[PDB]
């Protein structure tokens with residue numbers, strides 16, 4: 001009943017151009033079986049959304065990568081939030097909600113915006129830049145480690161550690177094997193910065209530890225929740241901002257609309273998250289036999305959700321392959337959906353908005369002027385190098 005496909009969604013060929021194979025996955029049926037990895041797949045918006053919003057049946061505590069924690073040891077202690085189900089998920093999630101809360105964004109917005117403006121001014125002095133290293137990476141590195149409260153020394157470990165984490169959700173291919181091989185120094189640095197004395201007053205890390213006397217988390221839970229922010233909160237924004245700049249470079253008509261109304265900055269970033277979907281995929285594990293889109297899936301089965309494909313599904317979106325900064329983007333799954341929906345989405349949107357605002361006010365044109373190089377990761381989609389010429393307004 002279920003179609004079986006040989007597509008490997010973690011192969012370099014797939015990463016290089018995933019869109020034809022994603023249509024093949026959507027059009028084969030609402031539920032597919034991927035023979036390469038012995039998992040079920042859902043690539044249409046409807047089934048991805050249904051799976052995300054039934055965490056009882058499609059759980060996260062057996063891992064959101066290919067590995068089933070019931071069968072194999074996790075490569076690092078499980079995340080207390082990403083790799084937990086309700087009710088154990090609920091109180092740590094509430095603490096991160098409050099640490100990254102609507103009210104908290106007010107304390108950081110002025111500094112994030114000034115750093116975004118300063119970066120664009122600096123880049124305009126050079127003219128020809130790499131929008132990945134010099135913008136998408138440089139800007140979050142200039143604000144997020146400080147907002148965490150990290151010391152200066154050792155920050156070079158942060159992007160390698162996060163790349164490792166996201167590669168580790170994948171199957172045991174060479175990308176994953178090599179990441180884990182190189183992991184020991186980055187793991188050591190990150191685990192050490194998660195301890196209370198190493199997190200500067202007023203930053204996100206200190207605020208997590210401060211919640212350990214409310215009864216929502218205990219002191220021994222705080223370091224792993226800091227670990228969540230250091231795993232999840234930097235590389236994702238790098239690829240989100242990189243996606244937005246790549247979109248503006250490829251769709252100059254949309255840059256022109258953004259210049260004419262810079263208040264579109266927040267939605268231009270949200271549309272870039274839909275359009276590129278920096279986090280491409282996550283798994284769930286079934287806790288019972290279940291009917292999904294007509295198919296019967298047994299207990300204990302891994303289900304691969306194609307978030308990027310769901311965000312391009314023509315059953316849900318008009319002209320899904322167009323970048324449209326006034327699109328009604330509500331309901332895209334680039335941040336997930338439901339109880340695990342990205343707890344840092346307000347930080348991500350703040351960074352994206354203020355960077356696109358700086359570009360909207362200061363730049364007249366963004367022209368690719370060198371070879372574009374893709375970066376390969378089992379979970380993240382983004383570029384390694386994006387040479388652009390920035391023309392000043």
Ligand code: HEM
Pocket residue numbers: 060064081082083093096100228229232233234236237239240241273277278279282333334335336337339340341342343344345347348
């Ligand atoms: C463009 C940037 C980002 C994207 C595309 C993104 C994507 C996602 C997605 C798809 C999920 C859901 C995972 C699932 O359902 O299993 C998620 C959850 C999460 N995100 Fe983000 N994220 C971004 C930025 C951030 C930032 C800036 C932070 C922290 C400062 C962060 C921290 C987290 C955490 C801790 C979770 C787990 C939440 C839970 O399990 O309840 N993320 N993110």
Ligand SMILES: CNc1cccc(C(=O)O)c1
Pocket residue numbers: 079080081082083165166227228229231232279
């Ligand atoms: C998607 N969000 C995410 C990614 C990687 C790690 C974690 C974590 O909680 O460690 C969360």
Ligand SMILES: [Cl-]
Pocket residue numbers: 076187190
């Ligand atoms: Cl680790």
